[PDB]
């Protein structure tokens, strides 16, 4: 692929990204910065503010867990629509398409969650709410450990200042990972990823002349995302082993079943 083709690929992905994900980083940061004509998000900072704000957005910890799970389920659907737009993806063996989503969806979720985060909290419900980092961390033992690792990642990731156009290609790169366990036919997948990484390299050079080695920095984050999944899974294990009325949504259940 030569530059013109790489640029066309980047725009193709950006447009499908815009059609697949309702809340972009652009909108999100505008809200976070207060640089929108929109009314400021409702702030959830405790149990009272949560119950109270449930008009635009069991025990508290579990209500928050269920809200997050509802959102994850919707995010998986959005990511699946995006994947199907990546040139070459739907021509792959259907079983490999399933594998790539199975492993890729949570990594993408955390990537996009960063767009919604600052060091103080996170936008929820289409950006209509803002749940504080401190509040989440105060959740009783098991539950207070879930979001914090994502905040820590987001703070460092957000320092790279990527925009939606950069992110479109990055997310495609992550989806087209040829080393997912159980792939039937790696070559076609790695071929596509090769094109995407080329498009990403060019995108970052053009869009961020100031960030020397940004490509290299961003590549290292792909591996950070994998560790986040590992830790998250271990925490889900504790919820499974020692919790009351705790059950995952069937889509989440099939994603986590025999994951690694």
């Amino acid at each position: 692929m030569e530059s013109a083709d790489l640029r066309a690929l980047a725009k193709h992905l950006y447009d499908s990204y815009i059609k697949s994900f309702p809340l972009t980083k652009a909108k999100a940061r505008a809200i976070l910065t207060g640089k929108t004509t929109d009314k400021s998000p409702f702030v959830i900072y405790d149990m009272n503010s949560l119950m109270m704000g449930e008009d635009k957005i069991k025990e508290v910890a579990i209500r928050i867990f269920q809200g997050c799970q509802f959102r994850s389920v919707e995010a998986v659907q959005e990511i699946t629509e995006y994947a199907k737009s990546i040139p070459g993806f739907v021509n792959l063996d259907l079983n490999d398409q399933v594998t790539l989503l199975k492993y890729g969806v949570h990594e993408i979720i955390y990537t996009m969650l960063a767009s919604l985060m600052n060091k103080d909290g996170v936008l929820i419900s289409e950006g209509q709410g803002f749940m504080t980092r401190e509040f989440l961390k105060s959740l009783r033992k098991p539950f207070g450990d879930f979001m914090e690792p994502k905040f820590e990642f987001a703070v460092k990731f957000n320092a790279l200042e990527l925009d939606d156009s950069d992110l479109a290609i990055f997310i495609a790169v992550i989806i087209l990972s040829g080393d997912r366990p159980g792939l039937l036919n790696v070559k076609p997948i790695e071929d596509i990823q090769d094109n995407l990484l080329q498009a990403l390299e060019l995108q970052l050079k053009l869009n961020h002349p100031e960030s020397s080695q940004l490509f290299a920095k961003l590549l290292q984050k792909m591996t950070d995302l994998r560790q986040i999944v590992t830790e998250h899974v271990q925490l889900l294990q504790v919820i499974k082993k020692t919790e009351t009325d705790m059950s995952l949504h069937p889509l989440l259940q099939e994603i986590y079943k025999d994951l690694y």
Partner: peptide, 16 residues
């Protein structure tokens, strides 16, 4: 011998 599509009914459905 159960394929990926066979053990991920929802994802398979989403992909269709």
């Amino acid at each position: 011998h159960s394929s990926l599509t066979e053990r991920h009914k929802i994802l398979h459905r989403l992909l269709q």
